[model samples]
Target chain A: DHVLQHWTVDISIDEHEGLTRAKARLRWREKELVGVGLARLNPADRNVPEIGDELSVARALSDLGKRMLKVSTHDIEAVTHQPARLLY
Target chain B: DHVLQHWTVDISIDEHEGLTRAKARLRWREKELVGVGLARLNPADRNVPEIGDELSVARALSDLGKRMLKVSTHDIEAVTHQPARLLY
Candidate 1:
């Protein structure tokens, strides 16, 4: 038997004073997780909103993914009653 | 003194047998971190290439970001000689 699942993530971003910030919230089943990221504009570099947005959004999603791995590790150990082993 | 920094991440993806995988390597200041992600096609759903690409890439990036945070924490404590605290 195969099971289907749908996971969702919502993200918000803001930029000001050469700093761009992003926050992502992921929802799966009954759990919700939030992740954050920040990108600072270097003084010598040109300020481009698109690059900042890309970097920040990617960073935020990465944070969320790490948290999911953590939870998965714990759950795996709980079900197996042994240390979970993976190269990751 | 404000210092400028540039970090880069290279990502590769592959799909085979209803499984899509992504591997990402982030490079920054003499350090390289790698992350991996996999997306499985749901049995009940239509397979969409773009969605899988986004999901796996985001997941790989998230793992890389998490590793960066870990390294940052260790470096902070090493320099400060105290426990690091952040909302993260």
Candidate 2:
């Protein structure tokens, strides 16, 4: 069975400073996972909400795709940072 | 007045051999461009880290969300790419 997950976070971006630094959250169900992608809006683009979330989620989805292909040994870990239950 | 980009590339994925044949370096500043929406990990997966970037430099004021859009179109070169981009 497959399900959809969603969530949100707070952040600031900067074009010059960018997300020079960050902490990522990985989410997944079974073999599917997301990496929330990358975000950098601090000095160069501050207040750029969802970049991480988007990246993370997208990552998760991409991860799932990888799993589907039976690829990688990178490590498929589930997420504890549950977003909102997105049931579609 | 917008000029901010990022860079980074680290490949340790073997499950994704398909990436063994990839060289994508596309960015933008207008029309809201971005194609990092897909990143299958593992050679079998599209580890679009950007989902292909250890190098998808994007950024705005939303760490989670940016001035980018997930757009889809036919490939500019071959006919086997999603051609997704970022914009806001």
Candidate 3:
């Protein structure tokens, strides 16, 4: 029999001074995961809210992505009883 | 002197055999990371597209989060000359 699992993600963005921040939260079953990202508005760069949001959100998600790879590698190793090499 | 970093996540979804799959890809600087998640639509649950999207995306992101914690812990241990424990 196949089992089903559910998961979800929520993203939020904020601005402070010359910096923009984004936090992405992921939920699966009873567990929660979170990622955070920040972007700075350089003096020469255009100060646009959309740009900041895009940059920050992207960074936060990227952080979470790296985590997923690491966790999967660890789990694979645990199951195989051998060192699992990560191709990424 | 704070150096700025840019990261991004791209999520894609696919549906097949009553199952929904989501893949999240993240890139920072020159490195790339990826996370994947899946949700199954039971016969009783409402077969809504939005629900599937939410569930799968959240799961993929959550997977990423766990990996992030693991990698961060390893890095911290390497730097501090001590073992790092993750609270999550």
Candidate 4:
């Protein structure tokens, strides 16, 4: 079938109690997926917002990766007529 | 207890058979989640890449939202010591 799809993502960060928190929102088609991450500044380490952003964004992406795999696996199982127990 | 976490998201789009396809990846902590969405242009409709991107991204986000709800629901049940059937 002739089709087109577009996707986009946005990330936001905040700081609280010396910890940096990040949330990622992914959009595609009619779906929205959200992932959250946090980072802390140790007493000995310098506080850098950029570094915190990077760490938090990485963690959020990792969360999305796992969810994608899980959903994909579920889709594959449905198509293959396999039991969930066997897949795990 | 002191804790830190991080999260991130990335989106990519590709064209195939006149269809725009988009995929979003989310990462957090030691886990990752992913979502995919697609869009198509009608023969009579104007061919606009931006529109396709928006549609696809929205679809992907919606998918992600659904997954998040599902996973969260599961988590809540586990914490509450409730049966899955009851929650569903």
Top model by lDDT, which number? 1
TM per candidate: 0.51, 0.24, 0.49, 0.48
Q: Each predicted model: what fraction of the native A–B Cα contacts (within 8 Å) does it retain?
A: 0.14, 0.04, 0.03, 0.14
Ranked candidates (lDDT, high to low): 1, 3, 4, 2
TM-score: model 4 vs. ground truth: 0.48
Indicate whether candidate 2 or candidate 4 has the larger lDDT: 4
Better of 1 and 4 by lDDT: 1
Could you tell me which 10 consecutive residues in candidate 2 chain B have the lowest summed lDDT? B55-64
> How well is each residue in A37-72 modelled by candidate 3, as lDDT tens digits?
776665544444444555566567666545554554
Off by over 4 Å in 2: A1-36, A71-88, B1-88
Q: After superposition, how far is residue A59 of candidate 4 from its true place, in Å?
A: 18
DockQ score, prediction 3? 0.06
Question: Could you give the C-alpha RMSD of every candidate to the true structure, in order shown?
Answer: 10.6, 15.8, 12.4, 13.0
- Which candidate's DockQ is highest? 1
Q: Least lDDT summed over 10 consecutive residues: which range in candidate 1 chain A?
A: A1-10
Across A1-88, the per-residue lDDT of candidate 2 in tens digits comes to: 2212222221222223343322222222322322233444333224443343333333333333333223222222112222322111
Those runs of model 4 whose alpha carbons end farther than 4 Å from true positions after fitting are A1-8, A13-88, B1-6, B84-88
Model 4, B1-88: lDDT tens per residue?
4334333446666765556676766664434566677766545333444444554554554454445444544443545467542111
lDDT of 4: 0.52
Q: Which scores better on DockQ, 1 or 2? A: 1
lDDT of 1: 0.58
Give a tens-digit lDDT track for model 2, residues B22-88.
2212232222322222223444324333222221111111211232224112111112333445432
